[PDB]
Design a protein around this nucleic acid. Structure first.
Lengths: 71, 71
DNA sequence: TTTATCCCGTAGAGCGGATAA
DNA sequence: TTTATCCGCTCTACGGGATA
């Protein structure tokens, strides 16, 4: 786990976590009450994704986040 | 710097950093080129804030973020 | 099976700008 | 001076649903 500097970096990292556990978009989406389409839009086009969707997906991946120094 | 689980919690943490360093909304907005109004809306109503905005504000506070296990 | 896209709908963001306290 | 809240605008999210 490393520092994250952009939505793109962030989505890519979460996509990796998702793949590495063999979860489909649909599994996650059902698990948290959002659309499969919505996990797709977040993964390909995260800039305009809302903070609520982020935290939901984050939770579905059994992940959290903290803030840190940018350095 | 503890684990964050919601937009409200995230905004609260970031607002605290703002105040602790004695920074105003206006000057953070000027720094990264967004509306003062946008920082206000983020601090009080983060749910539908976008990821770009979140990252722009993080940067303006010299913060970054990191992923971690939810526990 | 999996993911990406598009329709409609309603909702809200974030902009320039101007207040409103 | 600092922060919250409008208007009017354009842009997109995200929902249900259906494809591609």
């Amino acid at each position: 786990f490393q520092k994250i500097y952009s939505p793109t970096q962030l989505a890519n990292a979460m996509k990796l976590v998702r793949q590495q556990n063999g979860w489909t978009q649909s599994e996650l989406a059902k698990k948290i009450g959002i659309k499969q389409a919505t996990i797709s839009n977040f993964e390909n086009n995260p800039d305009n994704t809302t903070l609520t969707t982020f935290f939901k997906i984050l939770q579905s991946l059994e992940l959290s986040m903290t803030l840190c120094d940018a350095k």
